[PDB]
Amino acid sequence: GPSVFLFPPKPKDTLMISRTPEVTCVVVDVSHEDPEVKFNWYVDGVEVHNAKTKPREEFANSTYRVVSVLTVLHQDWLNGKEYKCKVSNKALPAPIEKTISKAKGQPREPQVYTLPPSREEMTKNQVSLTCLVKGFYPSDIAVEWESNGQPENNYKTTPPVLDSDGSFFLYSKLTVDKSRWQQGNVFSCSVMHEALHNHYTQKSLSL
Amino acid sequence: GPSVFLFPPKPKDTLMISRTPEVTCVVVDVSHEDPEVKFNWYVDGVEVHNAKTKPREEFANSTYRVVSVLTVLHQDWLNGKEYKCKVSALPAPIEKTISKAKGQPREPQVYTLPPSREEMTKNQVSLTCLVKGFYPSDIAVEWESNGQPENNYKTTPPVLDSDGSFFLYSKLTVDKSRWQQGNVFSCSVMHEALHNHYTQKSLSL
Numbered sequence: 349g350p351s352v353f354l355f356p357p358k359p360k361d362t363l364m365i366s367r368t369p370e371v372t373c374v375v376v377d378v379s380h381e382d383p384e385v386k387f388n389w390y391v392d393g394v395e396v397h398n399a400k401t402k403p404r405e406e407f408a409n410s411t412y413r414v415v416s417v418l419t420v421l422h423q424d425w426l427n428g429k430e431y432k433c434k435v436s437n438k439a440l441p442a443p444i445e446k447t448i449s450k451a452k453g454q455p456r457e458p459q460v461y462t463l464p465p466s467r468e469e470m471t472k473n474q475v476s477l478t479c480l481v482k483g484f485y486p487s488d489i490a491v492e493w494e495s496n497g498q499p500e501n502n503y504k505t506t507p508p509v510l511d512s513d514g515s516f517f518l519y520s521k522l523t524v525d526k527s528r529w530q531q532g533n534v535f536s537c538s539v540m541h542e543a544l545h546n547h548y549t550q551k552s553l554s555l
Numbered sequence: 556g557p558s559v560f561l562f563p564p565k566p567k568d569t570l571m572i573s574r575t576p577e578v579t580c581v582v583v584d585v586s587h588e589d590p591e592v593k594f595n596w597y598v599d600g601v602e603v604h605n606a607k608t609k610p611r612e613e614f615a616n617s618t619y620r621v622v623s624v625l626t627v628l629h630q631d632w633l634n635g636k637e638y639k640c641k642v643s644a645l646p647a648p649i650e651k652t653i654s655k656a657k658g659q660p661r662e663p664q665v666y667t668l669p670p671s672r673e674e675m676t677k678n679q680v681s682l683t684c685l686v687k688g689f690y691p692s693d694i695a696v697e698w699e700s701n702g703q704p705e706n707n708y709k710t711t712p713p714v715l716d717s718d719g720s721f722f723l724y725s726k727l728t729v730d731k732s733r734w735q736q737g738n739v740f741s742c743s744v745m746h747e748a749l750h751n752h753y754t755q756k757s758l759s760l
């Protein structure tokens with residue numbers, strides 16, 4: 349019948365105390381003639397009742413989609429506490445139990461190296477800046493680009509890749525005009541990982 | 556009941572006439588107490604006989620997958636021909652279709668990047684290869700040093716870039732010593748839009 353998916357909190361939400369993290373239980377393909385679902389959240393076995401059910405959606409399919417959100421404590425997720433979502437539906441015989449938690453294992457603090465473009469690239473109106481982030485565990489991490497305080501435009505970050513030493517790495521590419529590189533402006537790679545100091549580090553790249 | 560999954564040839568196979576590209580019609584969940592199955596391969600609607608079965612009759616946990624392999628022409632795959640597998644305890648035969656990713660091909664650019672001066676500290680540094688603005692995602696990237704292909708490199712998946720193009724990076728991990736000597740390390744990239752479907756970019760201290 350209906351399928352159930354559990355989505356962990358965004359890394360940036362857990363690494364900054366100022367921000368609000370939350371585990372998300374999304375159950376889809378719930379039948380049109382069975383609107384009533386029943387969530388049961390469990391933090392390390394202990395059932396909690398501070399969750400909140402977002403408003404539901406009707407699709408072209410006509411199969412309704414119900415989402416329940418539980419706000420968590422940053423340290424509780426950082427401590428690797430298990431979160432278990434139990435979805436109960438009138439169509440299914442047995443409720444669907446799902447479980448999500450922080451990736452288990454000895455954490456490693458990422459090293460971050462900024463790499464300038466190549467001469468061969470210079471010929472072009474738009475050159476690329478590279479940020480190498482390697483040797484981090486787990487895969488949870490958030491990387492951004494900025495210049496002179498405000499966020500930078502046109503960057504993409506590649507997914508985490510499993511490396512030889514059992515750790516992850518990634519590369520982030522920021523596309524800027526040849527001018528802004530030759531004009532002497534200074535850009536910055538902001539890396540946010542839990543094993544870092546204050547869950548934050550920053551490397552400045554410039555001509 | 557039974558599921559039919561079809562997979563394209565490896566990108567490296569089609570970019571070299573020397574190698575042999577194959578289209579793979581993997582049938583899973585065959586069932587048990589019935590292991591029978593029939594295959595009908597089609598190229599642009601026109602059926603072709605020359606497909607070889609490999610695994611043979613099911614024996615497994617519920618099933619052992621029964622698979623059919625087609626050998627195809629390099630340029631025929633490069634000229635966007637559509638390949639269709641027709642698998643026939645089933646009311647209607649399952650038909651799957653696959654072909655080269657449609658779109659406009661773009662000539663990749665390759666830029667090799669030395670390690671940071673921050674990285675020297677470690678006796679195991681990293682070399683980088685940036686492949687930018689290619690399409691489709693079907694691409695090959697390998698690392699080389701003086702003819703001999705040493706592999707201590709990891710390659711990130713192709714990522715959809717803003718301008719609709721694909722890109723990726725590649726990281727070769729070597730001892731600092733080799734970089735200190737002044738050795739040369741080449742990035743090999745293979746893409747259909749490229750010249751001779753191949754390009755090389757050397758990097759050295």
Ligand SMILES: *[C@@H]1O[C@H](CO[C@@H]2O[C@@H](C)[C@@H](O)[C@@H](O)[C@@H]2O)[C@@H](O[C@@H]2O[C@H](CO)[C@@H](O[C@@H]3O[C@H](CO[C@H]4O[C@H](CO)[C@@H](O)[C@H](O)[C@@H]4O[C@@H]4O[C@H](CO)[C@@H](O)[C@H](O)[C@H]4NC(C)=O)[C@@H](O)[C@H](O[C@H]4O[C@H](CO)[C@@H](O)[C@H](O)[C@@H]4O[C@@H]4O[C@H](CO)[C@@H](O)[C@H](O)[C@H]4NC(C)=O)[C@@H]3O)[C@H](O)[C@H]2NC(C)=O)[C@H](O)[C@H]1NC(C)=O
Pocket residue numbers: 351353355372374376377407408409411413
């Ligand atoms: C009827 O329609 C609905 C709704 O679809 C919408 O309407 C229809 C009419 C069309 O117009 C659609 O185009 C339109 O979108 C269909 O609903 C879909 O159902 C499928 C399953 O059949 C779901 O697939 C799952 O997707 C998740 C990833 O989902 C995120 O990303 C999507 C884009 O990529 C996005 O659309 C989703 O909303 C969702 O977005 C995330 O949202 C969270 C929470 O809000 C947010 O915080 C995130 O940032 C955001 N992410 C992004 C990228 O935007 C995927 O994870 C699922 O994969 C798991 O399950 C598979 C088996 O089902 C398995 O093969 C996968 O490998 C994977 O398995 C998991 O893997 C992890 C790690 O390896 C592991 O830890 C887990 O244990 C394992 N899971 C288990 C236990 O199995 C899966 O692919 C769609 O999300 C869902 N769409 C939406 C929009 O909700 C419906 O199918 C239609 N029904 C019929 C009968 O046709």
